[PDB]
mmCIF file of C-alpha atoms and ligand atoms in Angstrom:
data_model
loop_
_atom_site.group_PDB
_atom_site.id
_atom_site.type_symbol
_atom_site.label_atom_id
_atom_site.label_comp_id
_atom_site.label_asym_id
_atom_site.label_seq_id
_atom_site.Cartn_x
_atom_site.Cartn_y
_atom_site.Cartn_z
ATOM 1 C CA UNK A 1 72.383 110.359 89.345
ATOM 2 C CA UNK A 2 76.168 110.276 88.556
ATOM 3 C CA UNK A 3 79.483 111.001 90.320
ATOM 4 C CA UNK A 4 81.786 113.604 88.906
ATOM 5 C CA UNK A 5 84.790 115.033 90.685
ATOM 6 C CA UNK A 6 83.710 118.644 90.680
ATOM 7 C CA UNK A 7 85.076 121.944 91.905
ATOM 8 C CA UNK A 8 83.066 124.415 93.898
ATOM 9 C CA UNK A 9 82.320 127.489 91.817
ATOM 10 C CA UNK A 10 85.372 129.690 91.532
ATOM 11 C CA UNK A 11 83.799 133.122 91.186
ATOM 12 C CA UNK A 12 84.336 134.491 94.698
ATOM 13 C CA UNK A 13 88.000 133.481 94.511
ATOM 14 C CA UNK A 14 88.604 134.639 90.910
ATOM 15 C CA UNK A 15 88.277 138.236 91.965
ATOM 16 C CA UNK A 16 90.924 137.776 94.743
ATOM 17 C CA UNK A 17 93.750 136.749 92.375
ATOM 18 C CA UNK A 18 96.507 139.177 91.279
ATOM 19 C CA UNK A 19 99.780 139.213 89.277
ATOM 20 C CA UNK A 20 102.795 139.677 91.604
ATOM 21 C CA UNK A 21 106.092 140.589 89.972
ATOM 22 C CA UNK A 22 109.474 140.810 91.633
ATOM 23 C CA UNK A 23 112.241 141.766 89.294
ATOM 24 C CA UNK A 24 111.483 139.649 86.271
ATOM 25 C CA UNK A 25 109.919 136.784 88.295
ATOM 26 C CA UNK A 26 106.083 136.566 88.015
ATOM 27 C CA UNK A 27 103.571 134.553 89.944
ATOM 28 C CA UNK A 28 100.128 134.782 91.527
ATOM 29 C CA UNK A 29 98.928 136.517 94.687
ATOM 30 C CA UNK A 30 95.757 136.272 96.753
ATOM 31 C CA UNK A 31 94.396 139.682 97.608
ATOM 32 C CA UNK A 32 92.162 139.775 100.681
ATOM 33 C CA UNK A 33 91.413 143.137 102.261
ATOM 34 C CA UNK A 34 94.597 145.165 101.814
ATOM 35 C CA UNK A 35 96.928 142.134 101.813
ATOM 36 C CA UNK A 36 98.277 140.176 98.851
ATOM 37 C CA UNK A 37 99.552 136.836 100.141
ATOM 38 C CA UNK A 38 101.894 135.032 97.773
ATOM 39 C CA UNK A 39 104.763 132.554 97.712
ATOM 40 C CA UNK A 40 107.978 133.978 99.024
ATOM 41 C CA UNK A 41 110.235 132.647 96.346
ATOM 42 C CA UNK A 42 108.997 135.432 94.089
ATOM 43 C CA UNK A 43 112.021 137.234 95.610
ATOM 44 C CA UNK A 44 114.379 134.295 95.291
ATOM 45 C CA UNK A 45 117.531 135.178 93.410
ATOM 46 C CA UNK A 46 117.924 131.900 91.484
ATOM 47 C CA UNK A 47 116.811 128.279 91.224
ATOM 48 C CA UNK A 48 119.994 126.136 91.106
ATOM 49 C CA UNK A 49 121.665 126.771 94.519
ATOM 50 C CA UNK A 50 120.164 126.939 98.040
ATOM 51 C CA UNK A 51 118.389 130.199 98.917
ATOM 52 C CA UNK A 52 119.045 132.281 102.009
ATOM 53 C CA UNK A 53 115.537 133.717 102.459
ATOM 54 C CA UNK A 54 116.531 135.706 105.531
ATOM 55 C CA UNK A 55 119.118 137.494 103.292
ATOM 56 C CA UNK A 56 116.744 137.768 100.299
ATOM 57 C CA UNK A 57 114.094 139.386 102.475
ATOM 58 C CA UNK A 58 116.476 141.790 104.248
ATOM 59 C CA UNK A 59 117.923 142.853 100.846
ATOM 60 C CA UNK A 60 114.509 142.925 99.219
ATOM 61 C CA UNK A 61 113.587 146.382 97.844
ATOM 62 C CA UNK A 62 109.921 147.405 97.480
ATOM 63 C CA UNK A 63 110.632 149.249 94.242
ATOM 64 C CA UNK A 64 111.085 145.911 92.375
ATOM 65 C CA UNK A 65 107.597 144.698 93.239
ATOM 66 C CA UNK A 66 104.806 145.288 90.761
ATOM 67 C CA UNK A 67 101.413 143.988 91.837
ATOM 68 C CA UNK A 68 98.737 144.350 89.157
ATOM 69 C CA UNK A 69 95.290 142.971 88.535
ATOM 70 C CA UNK A 70 93.817 142.918 85.062
ATOM 71 C CA UNK A 71 96.317 145.617 84.183
ATOM 72 C CA UNK A 72 95.283 147.868 87.129
ATOM 73 C CA UNK A 73 97.626 149.083 89.740
ATOM 74 C CA UNK A 74 98.016 147.948 93.345
ATOM 75 C CA UNK A 75 100.629 149.802 95.297
ATOM 76 C CA UNK A 76 102.950 148.051 97.666
ATOM 77 C CA UNK A 77 103.165 149.683 101.033
ATOM 78 C CA UNK A 78 105.159 147.003 102.761
ATOM 79 C CA UNK A 79 106.076 143.341 102.955
ATOM 80 C CA UNK A 80 106.401 140.847 105.863
ATOM 81 C CA UNK A 81 107.566 137.250 105.486
ATOM 82 C CA UNK A 82 105.755 134.348 107.251
ATOM 83 C CA UNK A 83 107.152 130.901 106.617
ATOM 84 C CA UNK A 84 107.129 130.310 102.848
ATOM 85 C CA UNK A 85 104.774 133.249 102.065
ATOM 86 C CA UNK A 86 104.974 137.043 101.796
ATOM 87 C CA UNK A 87 102.239 139.269 103.073
ATOM 88 C CA UNK A 88 102.456 142.272 100.782
ATOM 89 C CA UNK A 89 100.418 145.166 102.273
ATOM 90 C CA UNK A 90 98.854 147.264 99.523
ATOM 91 C CA UNK A 91 97.208 150.626 99.012
ATOM 92 C CA UNK A 92 93.698 149.464 98.006
ATOM 93 C CA UNK A 93 91.488 147.047 99.912
ATOM 94 C CA UNK A 94 90.086 144.399 97.587
ATOM 95 C CA UNK A 95 86.486 145.430 97.302
ATOM 96 C CA UNK A 96 85.589 141.852 96.168
ATOM 97 C CA UNK A 97 87.065 140.246 99.289
ATOM 98 C CA UNK A 98 84.704 137.447 100.267
ATOM 99 C CA UNK A 99 83.713 136.395 103.741
ATOM 100 C CA UNK A 100 86.649 134.117 104.450
ATOM 101 C CA UNK A 101 88.855 132.318 106.871
ATOM 102 C CA UNK A 102 92.176 130.559 106.702
ATOM 103 C CA UNK A 103 92.051 126.821 107.401
ATOM 104 C CA UNK A 104 94.860 124.181 107.265
ATOM 105 C CA UNK A 105 94.130 120.917 105.384
ATOM 106 C CA UNK A 106 94.604 117.468 107.019
ATOM 107 C CA UNK A 107 95.279 114.621 104.629
ATOM 108 C CA UNK A 108 92.063 113.083 103.341
ATOM 109 C CA UNK A 109 90.519 116.549 103.010
ATOM 110 C CA UNK A 110 89.262 117.632 99.633
ATOM 111 C CA UNK A 111 89.528 121.148 98.241
ATOM 112 C CA UNK A 112 89.425 123.199 95.079
ATOM 113 C CA UNK A 113 92.470 124.519 93.215
ATOM 114 C CA UNK A 114 92.016 127.547 90.961
ATOM 115 C CA UNK A 115 94.958 127.294 88.616
ATOM 116 C CA UNK A 116 96.176 130.818 87.805
ATOM 117 C CA UNK A 117 98.915 132.331 85.595
ATOM 118 C CA UNK A 118 99.947 136.033 85.466
ATOM 119 C CA UNK A 119 97.227 136.707 88.061
ATOM 120 C CA UNK A 120 94.478 135.237 85.876
ATOM 121 C CA UNK A 121 92.415 132.149 86.637
ATOM 122 C CA UNK A 122 92.731 129.638 83.842
ATOM 123 C CA UNK A 123 91.214 126.544 85.396
ATOM 124 C CA UNK A 124 89.556 125.028 88.353
ATOM 125 C CA UNK A 125 89.518 121.546 89.723
ATOM 126 C CA UNK A 126 88.898 119.434 92.782
ATOM 127 C CA UNK A 127 91.668 117.494 94.438
ATOM 128 C CA UNK A 128 92.420 115.554 97.643
ATOM 129 C CA UNK A 129 95.273 116.216 100.049
ATOM 130 C CA UNK A 130 97.083 112.940 100.094
ATOM 131 C CA UNK A 131 98.610 111.153 103.078
ATOM 132 C CA UNK A 132 102.099 112.203 101.906
ATOM 133 C CA UNK A 133 101.011 115.882 101.956
ATOM 134 C CA UNK A 134 101.120 116.307 98.172
ATOM 135 C CA UNK A 135 98.361 116.693 95.590
ATOM 136 C CA UNK A 136 98.184 115.508 91.975
ATOM 137 C CA UNK A 137 97.415 118.733 90.104
ATOM 138 C CA UNK A 138 98.269 120.265 86.695
ATOM 139 C CA UNK A 139 100.536 123.220 86.968
ATOM 140 C CA UNK A 140 103.109 124.596 84.594
ATOM 141 C CA UNK A 141 105.511 127.524 84.946
ATOM 142 C CA UNK A 142 103.794 130.498 86.593
ATOM 143 C CA UNK A 143 101.175 128.586 88.532
ATOM 144 C CA UNK A 144 102.712 129.366 91.983
ATOM 145 C CA UNK A 145 100.413 131.367 94.113
ATOM 146 C CA UNK A 146 97.344 129.605 92.658
ATOM 147 C CA UNK A 147 94.997 129.397 95.618
ATOM 148 C CA UNK A 148 93.108 126.410 96.913
ATOM 149 C CA UNK A 149 89.948 126.786 98.886
ATOM 150 C CA UNK A 150 86.626 125.366 100.033
ATOM 151 C CA UNK A 151 83.384 127.155 100.335
ATOM 152 C CA UNK A 152 81.061 126.488 103.272
ATOM 153 C CA UNK A 153 77.247 126.819 103.059
ATOM 154 C CA UNK A 154 77.219 130.323 104.582
ATOM 155 C CA UNK A 155 79.297 131.335 101.500
ATOM 156 C CA UNK A 156 82.474 131.428 103.625
ATOM 157 C CA UNK A 157 85.644 130.817 101.626
ATOM 158 C CA UNK A 158 88.147 128.737 103.492
ATOM 159 C CA UNK A 159 91.506 129.653 101.980
ATOM 160 C CA UNK A 160 93.728 126.627 102.562
ATOM 161 C CA UNK A 161 96.450 126.287 99.909
ATOM 162 C CA UNK A 162 98.947 128.319 97.933
ATOM 163 C CA UNK A 163 100.792 126.523 95.231
ATOM 164 C CA UNK A 164 104.617 126.479 95.799
ATOM 165 C CA UNK A 165 106.534 123.550 94.212
ATOM 166 C CA UNK A 166 106.504 120.488 92.007
ATOM 167 C CA UNK A 167 108.580 117.579 93.356
ATOM 168 C CA UNK A 168 110.664 115.470 90.909
ATOM 169 C CA UNK A 169 107.867 112.869 90.863
ATOM 170 C CA UNK A 170 105.405 115.471 89.475
ATOM 171 C CA UNK A 171 103.574 115.681 92.856
ATOM 172 C CA UNK A 172 102.580 119.197 93.917
ATOM 173 C CA UNK A 173 103.103 120.967 97.199
ATOM 174 C CA UNK A 174 101.954 124.217 98.663
ATOM 175 C CA UNK A 175 101.616 126.032 101.903
ATOM 176 C CA UNK A 176 98.615 127.191 103.810
ATOM 177 C CA UNK A 177 98.162 130.922 104.238
ATOM 178 C CA UNK A 178 100.264 131.063 107.386
ATOM 179 C CA UNK A 179 103.161 129.986 105.265
ATOM 180 C CA UNK A 180 103.494 126.465 106.730
ATOM 181 C CA UNK A 181 104.326 124.209 103.812
ATOM 182 C CA UNK A 182 102.124 121.100 103.659
ATOM 183 C CA UNK A 183 103.971 118.066 105.042
ATOM 184 C CA UNK A 184 106.954 120.149 106.099
ATOM 185 C CA UNK A 185 108.570 120.131 102.631
ATOM 186 C CA UNK A 186 110.879 123.051 101.848
ATOM 187 C CA UNK A 187 110.285 125.700 99.250
ATOM 188 C CA UNK A 188 113.749 125.320 97.876
ATOM 189 C CA UNK A 189 115.284 123.664 94.892
ATOM 190 C CA UNK A 190 116.296 120.651 96.862
ATOM 191 C CA UNK A 191 116.021 116.984 96.559
ATOM 192 C CA UNK A 192 112.930 116.079 98.454
ATOM 193 C CA UNK A 193 110.964 112.967 97.922
ATOM 194 C CA UNK A 194 107.443 112.391 99.280
ATOM 195 C CA UNK A 195 106.528 109.396 101.479
ATOM 196 C CA UNK A 196 104.429 106.628 99.850
ATOM 197 C CA UNK A 197 100.913 107.635 98.898
ATOM 198 C CA UNK A 198 98.199 105.602 100.636
ATOM 199 C CA UNK A 199 94.767 104.838 99.255
ATOM 200 C CA UNK A 200 92.302 106.913 101.177
ATOM 201 C CA UNK A 201 90.088 104.073 102.465
ATOM 202 C CA UNK A 202 87.294 106.292 103.735
ATOM 203 C CA UNK A 203 86.913 107.754 100.244
ATOM 204 C CA UNK A 204 86.964 104.246 98.743
ATOM 205 C CA UNK A 205 84.138 103.290 101.057
ATOM 206 C CA UNK A 206 82.105 106.373 100.060
ATOM 207 C CA UNK A 207 82.836 105.590 96.447
ATOM 208 C CA UNK A 208 81.378 102.106 96.883
ATOM 209 C CA UNK A 209 78.241 103.419 98.590
ATOM 210 C CA UNK A 210 77.892 105.729 95.614
ATOM 211 C CA UNK A 211 78.310 102.898 93.170
ATOM 212 C CA UNK A 212 75.557 101.008 95.050
ATOM 213 C CA UNK A 213 73.196 103.983 94.994
ATOM 214 C CA UNK A 214 73.863 104.321 91.251
ATOM 215 C CA UNK A 215 72.834 100.644 90.690
ATOM 216 C CA UNK A 216 76.387 99.294 90.444
ATOM 217 C CA UNK A 217 76.468 96.101 92.552
ATOM 218 C CA UNK A 218 78.331 93.359 90.567
ATOM 219 C CA UNK A 219 81.427 93.861 92.841
ATOM 220 C CA UNK A 220 79.569 93.459 96.122
ATOM 221 C CA UNK A 221 80.910 90.673 98.370
ATOM 222 C CA UNK A 222 78.934 88.591 100.933
ATOM 223 C CA UNK A 223 82.045 88.757 103.177
ATOM 224 C CA UNK A 224 82.028 91.171 106.202
ATOM 225 C CA UNK A 225 85.221 92.496 107.828
ATOM 226 C CA UNK A 226 85.292 94.596 110.991
ATOM 227 C CA UNK A 227 87.255 97.810 111.275
ATOM 228 C CA UNK A 228 90.336 96.477 113.206
ATOM 229 C CA UNK A 229 90.677 93.618 110.729
ATOM 230 C CA UNK A 230 90.475 95.997 107.799
ATOM 231 C CA UNK A 231 92.928 98.510 109.272
ATOM 232 C CA UNK A 232 95.501 95.732 109.799
ATOM 233 C CA UNK A 233 95.012 94.555 106.166
ATOM 234 C CA UNK A 234 95.347 98.167 104.984
ATOM 235 C CA UNK A 235 98.828 98.812 106.428
ATOM 236 C CA UNK A 236 100.028 95.741 104.582
ATOM 237 C CA UNK A 237 98.452 96.858 101.263
ATOM 238 C CA UNK A 238 98.864 100.653 100.816
ATOM 239 C CA UNK A 239 95.591 101.910 102.291
ATOM 240 C CA UNK A 240 94.693 104.131 105.201
ATOM 241 C CA UNK A 241 92.775 103.227 108.259
ATOM 242 C CA UNK A 242 89.030 103.596 108.106
ATOM 243 C CA UNK A 243 87.154 105.915 110.370
ATOM 244 C CA UNK A 244 84.282 105.171 112.737
ATOM 245 C CA UNK A 245 81.577 103.147 110.840
ATOM 246 C CA UNK A 246 78.874 105.487 112.287
ATOM 247 C CA UNK A 247 80.078 108.250 109.902
ATOM 248 C CA UNK A 248 78.471 106.373 107.032
ATOM 249 C CA UNK A 249 75.146 105.763 108.747
ATOM 250 C CA UNK A 250 73.113 107.622 106.167
ATOM 251 C CA UNK A 251 74.482 105.584 103.274
ATOM 252 C CA UNK A 252 74.399 102.337 105.233
ATOM 253 C CA UNK A 253 70.692 103.172 105.696
ATOM 254 C CA UNK A 254 69.849 104.149 102.162
ATOM 255 C CA UNK A 255 71.552 101.085 100.599
ATOM 256 C CA UNK A 256 71.124 98.573 103.467
ATOM 257 C CA UNK A 257 74.792 97.592 103.074
ATOM 258 C CA UNK A 258 77.131 97.952 106.108
ATOM 259 C CA UNK A 259 80.597 99.440 106.037
ATOM 260 C CA UNK A 260 81.883 96.068 107.120
ATOM 261 C CA UNK A 261 80.724 94.532 103.872
ATOM 262 C CA UNK A 262 82.309 97.327 101.799
ATOM 263 C CA UNK A 263 85.610 96.930 103.644
ATOM 264 C CA UNK A 264 85.563 93.237 102.739
ATOM 265 C CA UNK A 265 84.620 94.111 99.145
ATOM 266 C CA UNK A 266 87.598 96.544 99.113
ATOM 267 C CA UNK A 267 89.947 93.651 99.942
ATOM 268 C CA UNK A 268 88.789 91.505 96.930
ATOM 269 C CA UNK A 269 88.557 94.499 94.704
ATOM 270 C CA UNK A 270 92.197 95.458 95.513
ATOM 271 C CA UNK A 271 93.197 92.523 93.262
ATOM 272 C CA UNK A 272 91.736 94.086 90.009
ATOM 273 C CA UNK A 273 88.308 94.541 88.362
ATOM 274 C CA UNK A 274 88.634 91.850 85.645
ATOM 275 C CA UNK A 275 87.933 94.342 82.789
ATOM 276 C CA UNK A 276 84.665 95.398 84.441
ATOM 277 C CA UNK A 277 84.218 98.931 85.746
ATOM 278 C CA UNK A 278 82.639 100.611 88.771
ATOM 279 C CA UNK A 279 80.896 103.807 87.677
ATOM 280 C CA UNK A 280 83.338 103.869 84.749
ATOM 281 C CA UNK A 281 86.531 103.471 86.856
ATOM 282 C CA UNK A 282 88.725 100.356 86.167
ATOM 283 C CA UNK A 283 90.365 100.178 89.655
ATOM 284 C CA UNK A 284 89.218 101.454 93.078
ATOM 285 C CA UNK A 285 88.677 105.157 93.314
ATOM 286 C CA UNK A 286 89.525 107.269 96.337
ATOM 287 C CA UNK A 287 88.785 110.647 94.651
ATOM 288 C CA UNK A 288 85.569 111.232 96.636
ATOM 289 C CA UNK A 289 84.982 112.043 100.290
ATOM 290 C CA UNK A 290 81.946 110.878 102.140
ATOM 291 C CA UNK A 291 80.758 114.466 102.197
ATOM 292 C CA UNK A 292 81.156 114.676 98.388
ATOM 293 C CA UNK A 293 79.085 111.567 97.798
ATOM 294 C CA UNK A 294 76.360 112.677 100.258
ATOM 295 C CA UNK A 295 76.239 116.224 98.776
ATOM 296 C CA UNK A 296 76.263 114.934 95.165
ATOM 297 C CA UNK A 297 73.507 112.292 95.693
ATOM 298 C CA UNK A 298 71.282 113.989 98.278
ATOM 299 C CA UNK A 299 72.518 117.487 99.224
ATOM 300 C CA UNK A 300 69.873 119.948 97.948
ATOM 301 C CA UNK A 301 67.028 120.702 100.407
HETATM 302 C C1 D03 B 401 105.879 128.423 90.306
HETATM 303 O O1 D03 B 401 104.878 128.737 89.316
HETATM 304 C C2 D03 B 401 106.932 129.506 90.431
HETATM 305 O O2 D03 B 401 107.640 129.519 91.425
HETATM 306 N N1 D03 B 401 107.067 130.363 89.403
HETATM 307 C C3 D03 B 401 108.185 131.279 89.295
HETATM 308 C C4 D03 B 401 108.444 131.580 87.837
HETATM 309 C C5 D03 B 401 109.653 131.219 87.219
HETATM 310 C C6 D03 B 401 109.836 131.537 85.864
HETATM 311 C C7 D03 B 401 108.829 132.212 85.133
HETATM 312 C C8 D03 B 401 107.625 132.577 85.746
HETATM 313 C C9 D03 B 401 107.452 132.246 87.098
HETATM 314 C C10 D03 B 401 106.535 127.088 89.949
HETATM 315 C C11 D03 B 401 105.474 125.994 89.705
HETATM 316 C C12 D03 B 401 106.064 124.679 89.240
HETATM 317 C C13 D03 B 401 106.642 124.733 87.833
HETATM 318 C C14 D03 B 401 106.101 123.498 87.126
HETATM 319 N N2 D03 B 401 105.040 123.046 87.982
HETATM 320 C C15 D03 B 401 105.000 123.666 89.131
HETATM 321 O O3 D03 B 401 104.237 123.442 90.022
HETATM 322 N N3 D03 B 401 107.529 126.732 90.976
HETATM 323 C C16 D03 B 401 108.792 126.371 90.676
HETATM 324 O O4 D03 B 401 109.262 126.258 89.556
HETATM 325 C C17 D03 B 401 109.734 126.131 91.797
HETATM 326 C C18 D03 B 401 110.515 127.432 91.853
HETATM 327 C C19 D03 B 401 111.300 127.517 93.125
HETATM 328 C C20 D03 B 401 110.610 127.619 94.329
HETATM 329 C C21 D03 B 401 111.308 127.700 95.518
HETATM 330 C C22 D03 B 401 112.693 127.682 95.478
HETATM 331 C C23 D03 B 401 113.382 127.582 94.267
HETATM 332 C C24 D03 B 401 112.688 127.496 93.079
HETATM 333 N N4 D03 B 401 110.629 124.995 91.602
HETATM 334 C C25 D03 B 401 110.211 123.722 91.600
HETATM 335 O O5 D03 B 401 109.037 123.395 91.713
HETATM 336 C C26 D03 B 401 111.286 122.655 91.468
HETATM 337 C C27 D03 B 401 112.192 122.609 92.717
HETATM 338 C C28 D03 B 401 112.300 121.202 93.290
HETATM 339 C C29 D03 B 401 111.865 120.931 94.596
HETATM 340 C C30 D03 B 401 111.971 119.630 95.111
HETATM 341 C C31 D03 B 401 112.508 118.596 94.327
HETATM 342 C C32 D03 B 401 112.948 118.869 93.028
HETATM 343 C C33 D03 B 401 112.842 120.164 92.512
#
C-alpha cells in the first residue's frame, strides 16, 4: 500500500545530459544521437533588455560554444535554431542514446523532471503540467536545459520538456523539444503572468479512489453528482472538468464507489478537512493521475 509522488528512474536520461557553454553562460543540453538540444538563450547577450534572437543567432560564432560531458569533449559542428531551442550538431553520437521519441505535454499530463546543473543530474522528481502551462518545480540558476520525460513500458523515453524560465510567481516554464514553449510564454525577460491554476479534477478523483483503496473513507459522502453538474460547479470553484466516468471503471469496480459519489465528495471536501487528513494530505490533492494510482496500486503483472 501507499501513495508517493514518484519519478520514473532517471538512468537512461542521466547519460543524455551535457554541459553547454556559450561565452561565459552555462546551462544543460540533451544529447541524443549527434544532436545536443538546449535552450536558445544560452547565446543571449543579456538579461535586462529584450533579446533579438534572430540577430543573436546570425552573429553567433561556433568558436564560443564549449559542449562537455563529465569533462570530456564534444565538438560542435553546427547549430540551427528552432523556436526557443538550439540544435547543436556534434562530432560524436551519444552511444547511450535511449530508444526515444519527442512528445508534447497537454495539461493534466504528468512527467519527470531531472534537475541538472553544469550538465550533471542533481535531482529527479515527478510533476504535473498545470492548466496554465506551468509546473511547480525547484530550479535555481543553471537549471535551464534540465530535461523532462516519461518512460513507456517498452523502455521508450518520451522527451517532453526542456527547462527555460521561472515566472515572477515562481512558476516554471519550458519548451518541448521542437522549441515550442509550453503555453506560448516567451523565453525573454519580460513581464508575463500565468493564467489561474485550476485543480485537476481527474487527479482529485483518482486520489480519492486511492484513499478508499488504502482504507481512508471518513470523507466519503452519500451524495451523488453527475458529470455535467460537477463540471458546472468546477468552473465556479477553480477546478477542471472531469473526463468520461468510464475511465475510472477499474477503480469504481475495486472499491464499489462510483465517480459520481467522489465528485460529490469533492464538493464538500473543497470546504476544508477539519484537521483530519486523507492519506496524510490536509486539503485535496491533485498530484496523481489515474494512471499513477492504477500503476502504484496494481501495476505489476
Ligand atoms: C536557466 O538556468 C538559465 O537560463 N541559466 C543561464 C545562466 C545564467 C547565469 C549563470 C548560469 C546560467 C535559468 C533558470 C531560472 C533561474 C532560477 N530558476 C529558474 O528556473 N533561466 C533564467 O534565469 C532566465 C534567463 C533568461 C532566459 C531567456 C531570456 C532572458 C533571460 N530568466 C528568468 O527565468 C527570468 C525572466 C522572467 C520571465 C518572465 C517574467 C519575469 C522574469
